[model samples]
Target: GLDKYLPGIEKLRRGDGEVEVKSLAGKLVFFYFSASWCPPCRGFTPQLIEFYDKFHESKNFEVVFCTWDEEEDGFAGYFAKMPWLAVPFAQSEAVQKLSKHFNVESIPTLIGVDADSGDVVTTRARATLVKDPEGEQFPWKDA
Candidate 1:
């Protein structure tokens, strides 16, 4: 299911050293649309990192960053602070396509999806995570 858009994810070498897209089957996936230059993105990152650190060990959940940074250097610097996967800096245009798919119109937008079904579950995932930081409602469903 997730394979459709995952081909755009050219690489995630820095963190897990090349995650196989097939491995994401049945996982709850979140596309984090953000840029290092965005203040709100910077602010929300630690919270997201906290959420990731807590649950990523299960391998059934994952966050794939879709960066809006203008420069690869900036993307690298910012991405280093995260513990999850990311679209490579060279694929900014591809990342943009993913953002458009989700109708992401702002920085720090966290779009949640069901990898197994390849269906979007929430567009306001940032708010959902803020309200459920412990992931008490993991794979959060949108209202």
Candidate 2:
């Protein structure tokens, strides 16, 4: 289902262009829609970083950052701080389409989707995960 979306997506590795999207298949994909200019995004980023670290052991969950930055500098600067892969800035149009597909109305919205089946894990993931931060609430118990 995400066949077409595959070529359009990219994840930089050590500042070099690389492709690791295939590994994300069958996992819960976090479509992280955000921008450098957004304050809420700035605030949420660290929390996300912490959350990402906490769940990373599962290896069945991953995040694909979708940028809303205006320029390459801002995008790169902000993206560098992330441990997860990003939808390359060069494919901004594809990134735009992803946010549109989810009807994302605001920054820092983490929409969880099943990579293989393309089914939604949860639309209220950000909120859900936040509340369950104290324990292991990974792969999410419920959507």
Question: What TM-score would each prediction reach against the true structure?
Answer: 0.88, 0.84
Candidate 1, residue 14: Cα displacement in angstroms equals 3.6
**How much lDDT does candidate 1 score?**
0.79
lDDT of 1 by residue, 50-137 (tens): 9888778763678988899998788887888888888777777777778777788888899888888888887887878888988887
Once fitted onto the true fold, the runs of candidate 2 whose alpha carbons sit more than 4 angstroms away are 4-15, 135-143
lDDT of 2 at 97: 76
Stretches of model 1 off by over 4 angstroms after superposition: 7-11
Task: Let me know the TM-score candidate 2 reaches against the reference structure.
Answer: 0.84
